[model samples]
Target: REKDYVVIIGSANIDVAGYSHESLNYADSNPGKIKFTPGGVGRNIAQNLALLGNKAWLLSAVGSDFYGQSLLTQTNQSGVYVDKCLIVPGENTSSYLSLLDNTGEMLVAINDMNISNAITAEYLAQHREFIQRAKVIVADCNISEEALAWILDNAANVPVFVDPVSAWKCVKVRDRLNQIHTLKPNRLEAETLSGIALSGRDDVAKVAAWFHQHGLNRLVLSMGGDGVYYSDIRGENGWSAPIKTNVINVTGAGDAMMAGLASCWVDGMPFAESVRFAQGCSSMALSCEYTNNPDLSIANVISLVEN
Candidate 1:
């Protein structure tokens, strides 16, 4: 069968970010900007893929509310195929509200993603035909444990990519590394998954080995400020040094990288090349206040990678 579209199974949320203009006071309200954008690990990845000129499909769930309507419309306008997403009549759309300090780094946050529970194994099973023909399947831990297991079991032949959204949620994929084709984990999540306290470059190898020994084929471990390290089963590996850029917002950078990696894999690029491409994606993401960079494209990424 010819693989065509890339399907993303996970959560979709309306991101509410508060960007403070100056130093913050914990107890009192600080002057900041509140911006609402469509976001979620899986939804962001799907948007990135579509913005980069790919036929991307998202299989997530949302509420039949104003937020859901706007999210679907805006995401569809960005070129993603969102008709497959479920809209529950009574549920509230997922929302992620985060506070960013003057430095564009996250301070504290909260999320209401109870609607993600609607993305069940049975829902995924109903889309078996679409999943079967997808070139790649990308999932985030925002989905339920049972839904994650179902993706691994039912979509066995597809190259599934998993994003360990956070340290605690990352544990969802801890026991199923072998079934996943590619995994993108930040330093803390990697530490949690491998159970190895990573403090230096030496420990990275140990962590990678732990995942490989557990049957992972490709791993993209993000070490913020240091760089991104990549490895594959064939022994191909390298580190992509972080690209310097003016930081506006640190959200969705990993999701952009995942989109790049999945896009590169679809193009049959080698593991080493894919890391650089993906690194370029994340680098571009940092320069924008929005979670999904509007200027993202293959040519733009290539230019960023070249310079």
Candidate 2:
């Protein structure tokens, strides 16, 4: 049987990204090249999966406002099934403002995702059947705790892949780790949530074990140049070296990695192969100027893997 991959829950948003040569000091106005893109952890993953020739669906919440309409249209154009997206009237769309410096570093930014709370648990209860139809589910912690719990409870048969989004979001679902099949956390995020200072090679193995003991089925720890470490319940482990690439924007690198791994895993690829694909996608994402570009096709990813 063919695999059917879907991202059942997340908060959609409009990402306003600016590129500048000067350091981004929020207190001072810095002029730079600005680009508005339809982005959210869910949407970015869906778009990348579609680019890899998978049938992807996004079940997220967007407002009825203009930004929402534009975001929906763009998502449809990217080949995602947007019909599952909820449009709430009289609500504002989620958005983020980010600044990237010449070194491809994010100096500072702010995110307004309060509208994602509008996706109530009752709303998910109505779509329980659709949620169960998926082979895998991807979610971020930006949604309500009730909604997160509902997804975990109702989508029991499907594997749940999570991106904590931030340190604070990790706290919201910390107690429900058993429901998660996979977790993708960057360097700082891993330290923040696991309370283990991942300072060197030895620390990496210890931290990965800590998360697995706490109920995570698999842990993929991404430590920028330090490489990625993978661990599973049986204590089997693997690691992948990061591919060096020209940096443009680092905004969506983590999301791209999550999408890559989820896509390969759903396609029946082995665990080590999945990590290689994910690292390649993340490297490609960092080399791009924008977040959700569909140009990162399957062939592009495969070539990276082969190299």
Candidate 3:
């Protein structure tokens, strides 16, 4: 059945970033700039889909703290449907703090996602009926292992989109490999999942084949400097992701691409076209100093592809 809204089930958090003005040092309190923004893989994707002219509904949990209130307000303003989001009491909202170098490359980060622990299997079971109503489903690894498994188990009915989020969090999906519909993993996460070092295109092909054999229909693995390699269910069919250079911040570029795919896949766009559009969105997001790009637009994305 063709549905209208995309159901996003995963994380929601307040992001704190510290961009170093000079070179980063070890174990020292080195910081030049600090900013707080509402972010999280699922929330960011939901916002991006809404801005890209797609209807999105977020089914995640957040604390009833100050940051939670701020997060709700901003996400609502961005046109993401949040009525289904749960506001839990006596819980601290999730947060990810990143320390970036002057070149805007992430040096290290910390994630406090204890709040996402509330996204239990029971919660998902209660919402599975609602999730089945969506044309597309998106999720991130920040949620509980049980929750991810539940999503994978029930995702067969719709096009499910998943982001590895990070290498550490990606292991959970590796166990349920065959259940995922579409998966996006950065080089590190991909290597960790596939247990192969991506030395070149040959290695990328190998990794793609490994994932495809395990039941993945669409898999995109981002090779940091080498762009990305994609494969469809037929085989390791390749789609080259455009390499971006005008990058001001790389924090949310991956999330932006995943969001682009979610927006287009539900509209019946061809997978190849969706990959190109997602890369465009990734490039546009890289040009922003903030995690979420303010200039993200369909027109801007098309320009990236045409020009």
Which has the greatest lDDT?
1
> TM-score of predicted model 1?
0.93
After superposition, candidate 3 runs with Cα above 4 Å error: 1-3, 19-33, 99-108
Model 1: per-residue lDDT, tens digit, 252-297? 7998999999999987888888899999998889888688999999
TM for every model, in the order presented, reads 0.93, 0.91, 0.90
Residue 143's C-alpha lDDT in candidate 3? Answer: 90
Tens-place lDDT per residue, model 2, 1-307, is 4556576478788988777756656677777778788888878888887887778888888888887989989989988888878898868889998875776567688888898888788988788888888878988888888888888888857999988888778776677778888888878888987889989767988888778878889889887788998888777788788887787767678878888888888889988889988888888888887886567777898897778
- Mark the regions of model 1 whose C-alpha exceeds 4 Å error after superposition: 1-3, 19-32, 100-107
Instruction: List the candidates ranked by lDDT, beginning with the highest.
Output: 1, 3, 2
* Alpha-carbon RMSD of each model: 2.4, 2.7, 2.9
lDDT of 3 by residue, 1-307 (tens): 2258888888888888788777667668776888898788989888888888778888898997877878987899988888888888868888888876677677799988888888888888888788887888999999988898888788657878898888999898887777778999988888899898977767877888889777888987777777777789885377585655597767679878998888878768888788888998988888887777867878889888877
lDDT of each: 0.90, 0.82, 0.83
lDDT of 3: 0.83
1 against 3, candidate with superior lDDT: 1
**How does model 2 fare in lDDT?**
0.82
